[PDB]
Amino acid sequence: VIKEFMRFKVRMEGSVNGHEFEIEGEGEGRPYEGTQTAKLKVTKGGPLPFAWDILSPQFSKVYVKHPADIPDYKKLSFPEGFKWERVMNFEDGGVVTVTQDSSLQDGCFIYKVKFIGVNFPSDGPVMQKKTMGWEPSTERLYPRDGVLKGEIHKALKLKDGGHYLVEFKSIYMAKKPVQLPGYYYVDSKLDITSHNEDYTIVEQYERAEGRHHLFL
Amino acid sequence: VIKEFMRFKVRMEGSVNGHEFEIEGEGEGRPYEGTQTAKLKVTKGGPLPFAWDILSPQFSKVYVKHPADIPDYKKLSFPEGFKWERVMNFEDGGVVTVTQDSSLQDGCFIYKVKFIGVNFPSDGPVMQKKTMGWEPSTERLYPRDGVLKGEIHKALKLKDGGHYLVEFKSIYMAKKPVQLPGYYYVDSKLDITSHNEDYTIVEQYERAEGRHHLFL
Amino acid sequence: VIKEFMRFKVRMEGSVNGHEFEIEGEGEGRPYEGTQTAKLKVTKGGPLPFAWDILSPQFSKVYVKHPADIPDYKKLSFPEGFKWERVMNFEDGGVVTVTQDSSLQDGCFIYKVKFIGVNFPSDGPVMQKKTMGWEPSTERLYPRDGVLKGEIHKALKLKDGGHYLVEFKSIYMAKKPVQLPGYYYVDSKLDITSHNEDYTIVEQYERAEGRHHLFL
Amino acid sequence: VIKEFMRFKVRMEGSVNGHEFEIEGEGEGRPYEGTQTAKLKVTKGGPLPFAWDILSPQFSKVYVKHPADIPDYKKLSFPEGFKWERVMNFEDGGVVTVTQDSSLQDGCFIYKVKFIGVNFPSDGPVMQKKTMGWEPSTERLYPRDGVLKGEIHKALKLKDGGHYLVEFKSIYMAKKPVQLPGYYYVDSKLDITSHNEDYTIVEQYERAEGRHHLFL
Handedness of CA B122, B123, B129, B131 (dihedral sign): negative
Q: Strand, helix or coil at A143?
A: strand
Q: How far apart are CA C99 and CA A51, in angstroms?
A: 42
| Torsion of the alpha carbons at A64, A69, A70 and A73, rounded to the nearest 10 | 80
* Cβ-Cβ contacts under 8 Å, B163 against chain C: 142, 144, 183
Coil, strand or helix: which one is B124? coil
Touching chains, C (3+ CB pairs < 8 A) = B, D
| Beta-carbon-side half-sphere exposure of residue C143 (alpha carbons within 13 Å) | 15
Cβ-Cβ contacts under 8 Å, D101 against chain C:
18
Closest CA to C164 of C154, C178, C172: C154
CA–CA gap between residue A42 and residue A24 (Å, rounded): 7
Distance between alpha carbon A13 and the CA centroid of its chain, in Å?
15
The answer for residues whose C-beta is within 8 angstroms of residue A2's C-beta and 6 or more apart is A31, A62, A75, A78
Range of the domain at C83: 1-216
Longest Cα pair distance anywhere in chain C, in angstroms? 48
Cα–Cα distance measured from residue B134 to residue B156, given in angstroms and rounded to the nearest whole number = 5
Number of residues that make up chain C: 216
**Count of CB atoms situated within 10 Å of the CB of D182:** 12
- Candidates A138, A141, A151: best to mutate against D (most CBs of D within 10 A) is A138
Contact C139, C151 (CB under 8 A): yes
Chain B residues closer than 8 Å to A98 by CB: 116, 118
- Using only C-alpha atoms, chain D has a radius of gyration, in whole angstroms, of 17
CB B80 within 8 A of CB B103: yes
CA dist., res. B40 & res. B23, Å (int): 7
In what helix (H) or strand (E) does residue D181 lie, and over which residues does it extend? Answer: none
Residue B40 sits in a domain whose CATH number is 2.40.155.10
Task: Report d(CA A107, CA A6) in Å as an integer.
Answer: 7
B155 forms beta bridges with B165
Of D15, D83, D95, the CB nearest to C18: D83
How far is it, in rounded angstroms, from Cα C37 to Cα C59? Answer: 10
Closest CB to D15: pick one of C18, C99, C169: C99
Chain D positions in Cβ-Cβ contact with residue A151 (cut-off 8 Å): 153
Q: Is A97 on the interface with B (CB under 8 A)?
A: yes
Measured distance CA(B37)–CA(A8) in Å, rounded: 46
Q: Does A145 touch chain B (CB under 8 A)?
A: yes
Q: Nearest chain C Cα to B144, which residue?
A: C162
Strand stretches in C31-161, DSSP E? 35-44, 82-90, 95-105, 108-118, 131-134, 137-144, 147-158
Contact C166, C156 (CB under 8 A): yes
For chain B, which chains pass the contact test of at least 3 CB pairs under 8 Å? Answer: A, C
**Structural domain count of chain B:** 1
CB atoms within 10 A of CB D183: 16
CA B215 and chain centroid, separation: 27
CA atoms within 13 A on the CB side of D109: 33
In 3D space, the residue among B18, B12, B1 whose CA is nearest the CA of residue B122 turns out to be B18
Q: Cis peptide before C79, with omega less than 30 degrees from 0?
A: yes
C-alpha span between D156 and D154 (Å, rounded): 7
Q: Which chains touch A (3 or more CB pairs under 8 A)?
A: B, D
Structure obtained using:
X-ray
- DSSP line for D91-145: TTS-EEEEEEEEEEETTEEEEEEEEEEE---TTSTTTTT-EEEEPPEEEEEEEET
The continuous run of DSSP H or E covering C74 comes out as helix C73-76
Helix (H) or strand (E) holding C33: none
A203 CA to chain B: closest CA distance, Å? 27
Which H or E run includes A91?
none
Distance in angstroms (rounded) separating the CA atoms of residues B10 and B25: 5
Q: Which helix (H) or strand (E) holds D74?
A: helix D73-76
How close D215 comes to chain C (CA, Å)? Answer: 30
Chain D CB within 8 Å of residue A5 CB: no
Main-chain phi, psi angles of D65, to 5 degrees:
-65, 120
**Interchain contact B127–A (C-beta under 8 A):** no
Torsional sign, CA C139, C142, C145, C147 = positive
Contact C27, C11 (CB under 8 A): no
Cα B186 to Cα D190: distance, rounded to the nearest angstrom: 50
Distance CA B170, CA D103 (A): 47
Task: Please give the interface size between B and C, counted as residue pairs whose CB atoms are below 8 Å apart.
Answer: 58
Q: Which of C136, C142, C153 sits opposite B215 (nearest CB)?
A: C136
Residues 16-55 of B with CB under 8 A from A: 17-18
Report the C-alpha gap between A34 and A207 in whole angstroms.
5
Q: Report the chain C residue with the minimal C-alpha distance to residue B189.
A: C215
- What is the rounded distance in angstroms from the CA atom of residue D9 to the CA atom of residue C177? 41
In this complex, do D135 and A213 lie within 8 Å of one another by their Cβ atoms?
A: yes
Angle CA(B178)–CA(B181)–CA(B185) in degrees, nearest 5? 135
Cβ atoms C153, C164 nearer than 8 A: no
For residue A150, the distance in angstroms to the closest alpha carbon of chain B comes to: 11
d(CA A149, nearest CA chain D) in Å: 12
Which residues of B fall within a CB distance of 8 Å from C138? 138, 140, 185, 213
Q: Please choose, from the candidates C181, C183, C203, the residue with its C-alpha nearest in 3D space to the C-alpha of residue C68.
A: C181
Question: Do the beta carbons of residue D180 and residue D133 sit within 8 Å?
Answer: no
Measured between alpha carbons, how far is A12 from A5 in angstroms, rounded to an integer? 23
Find the CB nearest D140 among A153, A162, A213: A153
Which residue of C lies nearest to B210 if distances are taken between CA atoms? Answer: C214
CA atoms of D190 and C194, how far apart (whole Å): 50
Q: Are A37 and B121 contacting, i.e. CB atoms less than 8 angstroms apart?
A: no
Bond before B79 cis per omega within 30 degrees = yes
Cβ-nearest to A18 among B85, B117, B119: B85
- In chain B, residues with a C-beta closer than 8 Å to the C-beta of A118 are 85-87, 97-99, 171
d(CA A168, CA B97): 15
Q: Quote the radius of gyration of chain A (alpha carbons, Å).
A: 17
Is B96 strand, coil or helix? strand
Rounded CA-CA distance C136/A15 in Å is 35
Contact call for residues C192 and C33 (beta carbons, < 8 A): no
